[PDB]
Structure 1
């Protein structure tokens, strides 16, 4: 059972919820967490979805080794096998760019060779984490990373936006998490690329923005450095236009924070490992096949409508124990079946998100459960989307910044997009924060969806002519 309340003490809530939900398990090496099936199934579902969509695009999967040689630094060295030292120390690769892009320079010779489109599902190691937290700040995480090379900038840009739409769909259609499409500022884009696009999400309980996924128009700078050249149709050598795009198990974290409540998790039915848990009202020793037999008939029929079902027939636990257990785990539907239910030909179903109860005839069960699951998924999304809209304040001047930040809100303000002004704003907001102790605010994205910018509008900080509406807040 979850004791900490989600809005009073969020961090404690988060920890309690993900452990009592049987999502992760601890490990004797810091910053590392075992992903148990109740979370890994969610990864499996968003992975299958995204993989199907990028395969429609012509992206194909690959595997690159996890090691890199000396010809490459703050990196992890493997120096022995058994007790023997290696001839040359090898490193666990920092990035994938370093291994893939020489390979790309080999494989690309002519315009016939483009576009080249590769994706990799793997795990990533990061060595410097501050305070570890499952799915958010961890030593190892899972992701997918894709890397494309195209003959022209416009094709590459088109692909960047197509992938970004797939990330919108990952978060919104699968995990029911609303996100905002935008372009990163110069001070927050990938170091070597032309443009970074992003989907952003909001955590109301701490008012923090978090980056859901990135899609970079890398341009030619990497092709210049790595000598990825192709000869065009008229015989000249040209640099390829690259993109790269990535999404991680952080998405699981964003889903938890989005839909959980004081009772624990709420997993959207599209990714829940069990959509419907069947709980026999049995106490202690009451073993007759009457209840468990009807429970099995019901599981069979629900499964043939492609519903993911579990019967929790564990003898040594009370029905109320089981209710709380599966509520903390976040199953969207619970099917109570007891002697009175059996003696009426119905079942009682409870929704996890609202707690509403329904008495349903056994014949009606499969259609009504499909309907209720669609309703739960849409409800989760719509309420999160109203919360997101409610968390963004449209300001005009800098005096409105610190009020909004203290309402745990984001701000949308006209900005001149000058890079030094962003660092000044972060400095200023963090110092204002510090003195309020009696922290910093940064750009999240420049949204694709731009309100009108009246002629002559001034930037909310510098005073200079504002160019675009930018979204700011405190951030993960």
Structure 2
């Protein structure tokens, strides 16, 4: 049972929801959390979706070691890297690092495997864990010191083909968030301050948490250019015979995704899981009080529902009350609850409640599969749309710096015309830190959206005064 109100104390709400749903268990090593099956099975679904998709692009999976030697890693962040120094009581000759990211592990093998134009495109992915000693406050899913991710890394003959892939991947991240988790996101380009300094252009998919006004990078996909190619000597021979540097990409997305889905659709009763990723779509609860028939129809219903590929549990555990079950599967966010007592049995009917609105329906045995399929689409589409609206009511389109803090104090992002000059962003981060401080924080660029509004002729940068270039989305962030 959940008692903190999503709209009052958000961080306590979140903790209760992830704990009492049995998604997360607390752990003694700071920044690390145990992922219990209810949370893990959802990761399995997004993992499979993404994995299948990238496979259709010819990306292949691999596994590179979790250790990188010191001199390889330290060749061109630093404070977050975890170092192994001993085995038993014996010190290693040279300390070794646990993978924070894999560029320095993968790229020397690339330099080696890539020799001609015939060896391209090389497209590889891996699913693994990563360790970073995050200095910021940890949060289950969103920011953990060990997290699970995929990282994709690719090499191409031309910038054209690599950029095409950057976008294809970005679009798969939209789909992971938008089609699987029903979380709206905004495609965009990172400002030169926020991008991966190893690359030429970083693209992003960005999300928003209404309850605390924080934007959050949902995933990332980089046009690396050739900088890593010169650094690692990844070059090939073209059609002619001239040696050329490859054009690279990398891209990653994490268990952070689960966190965002939980915050987006969660309510005061706990989780709400979208049907496309719910391990249990429909839970069937037999009502039993004061004394056998019914258990038999329940089983028939499951088998019916499974021909529709509907994922179904029967909670027929006799050591729990029906009301306990109601509450349990509610807090866990099961999309549909199908009840069945004596009175229903004779009617040939079933009482079904949907988790997102609490609405109830009486539905005859014969109408279940198509009606539940109907209802499940509605829940999914409906969670997305209520979140898309929340997202858009959360962004304020604006023209001057004096608009900012009021918008930030309403826990909103702002969309603003900016000249995209280095200094401004840092000045904006600091002045906003200072105004937040004294109010007793900082606002950064989240992205430059692909979907640009029109920019009239003499429109000015909302902060410098210089002439604006494009519309940039700003806010407080994770």
Superposed pair shares fold, TM > 0.5: yes
Q: Does 1:414 align with 2:417?
A: yes
Per the TM alignment, residue 298 of structure 1 is displaced from its structure 2 partner at its CA by 1.2
**What pairs with 1:36-435 in structure 2 (closer than 5 Å)?**
36-71=36-71, 75-283=81-289, 289-435=292-438
* Kept in 2: contact 1:279–1:319 (CA 8 A): yes
Q: CA RMSD in A?
A: 1.4
Per the TM alignment, residue 131 of structure 1 is displaced from its structure 2 partner at its CA by 2.7
Distance in 2 between residues matched to 1:96 and 1:208, nearest whole Å: 28
Q: Which structure 1 residue ranges, 5 or more long, are not aligned?
A: none
Per the TM alignment, residue 291 of structure 1 is displaced from its structure 2 partner at its CA by 1.9
Per the TM alignment, residue 129 of structure 1 is displaced from its structure 2 partner at its CA by 4.2
* Kept in 1: contact 2:81–2:131 (CA 8 A): no
SS at match of 2:293: helix
Distance in 1 between residues matched to 2:195 and 2:153, nearest whole Å: 17
* Kept in 2: contact 1:66–1:92 (CA 8 A): yes
Distance in 2 between residues matched to 1:377 and 1:357, nearest whole Å: 17
1:358-382 C-alpha deviation (Å, 9 max, x unpaired): 0011111111111110111010111
Per the TM alignment, residue 83 of structure 1 is displaced from its structure 2 partner at its CA by 4.0
Per the TM alignment, residue 301 of structure 1 is displaced from its structure 2 partner at its CA by 1.3
Distance in 1 between residues matched to 2:26 and 2:141, nearest whole Å: 13
Per the TM alignment, residue 74 of structure 1 is displaced from its structure 2 partner at its CA by 5.7
Distance 1:45 1:74, change over 3 A: closer
Q: Which structure 2 residue ranges, 5 or more long, are not aligned?
A: 72-77
1:412-469 C-alpha deviation (Å, 9 max, x unpaired): 01000001100101111111111111x1111000000011100010000000000000
Distance in 1 between residues matched to 2:5 and 2:476, nearest whole Å: 22
* Kept in 2: contact 1:129–1:137 (CA 8 A): no
Per the TM alignment, residue 73 of structure 1 is displaced from its structure 2 partner at its CA by 7.3
- Name the counterpart of 1:460: 462
Distance in 1 between residues matched to 2:473 and 2:369, nearest whole Å: 44
1:208-263 C-alpha deviation (Å, 9 max, x unpaired): 10100000000011111111111111121111110100000000000001001111
* Kept in 2: contact 1:230–1:237 (CA 8 A): yes
* Kept in 2: contact 1:146–1:245 (CA 8 A): yes
Distance 1:73 1:213, change over 3 A: closer
* Kept in 1: contact 2:82–2:132 (CA 8 A): no
Distance 1:12 1:188, change over 3 A: same
* Kept in 2: contact 1:129–1:138 (CA 8 A): no
* Kept in 2: contact 1:259–1:267 (CA 8 A): yes
* Kept in 2: contact 1:444–1:473 (CA 8 A): yes
Normalised TM-score (structure 1): 0.97
Q: Which moved more, 1:259-268 or 1:315-324?
A: 315-324
Distance 1:151 1:366, change over 3 A: same
Distance in 2 between residues matched to 1:160 and 1:70, nearest whole Å: 30
Normalised TM-score (structure 2): 0.96
* Kept in 1: contact 2:82–2:131 (CA 8 A): no
SS at match of 1:355: coil
1:93-134 C-alpha deviation (Å, 9 max, x unpaired): 332000100000000111111111000011111123433221
SS at match of 1:343: helix
Per the TM alignment, residue 284 of structure 1 is displaced from its structure 2 partner at its CA by 7.0
Per the TM alignment, residue 317 of structure 1 is displaced from its structure 2 partner at its CA by 2.2
Distance in 2 between residues matched to 1:283 and 1:90, nearest whole Å: 62
* Kept in 1: contact 2:287–2:341 (CA 8 A): yes
Q: Which runs of 4+ in 1 moved over 6 A?
A: none
SS at match of 1:270: helix
Per the TM alignment, residue 77 of structure 1 is displaced from its structure 2 partner at its CA by 2.9
Distance in 2 between residues matched to 1:73 and 1:273, nearest whole Å: 38
Q: Which moved more, 1:97-106 or 1:81-90?
A: 81-90
* Kept in 1: contact 2:273–2:335 (CA 8 A): yes
Per the TM alignment, residue 80 of structure 1 is displaced from its structure 2 partner at its CA by 3.1
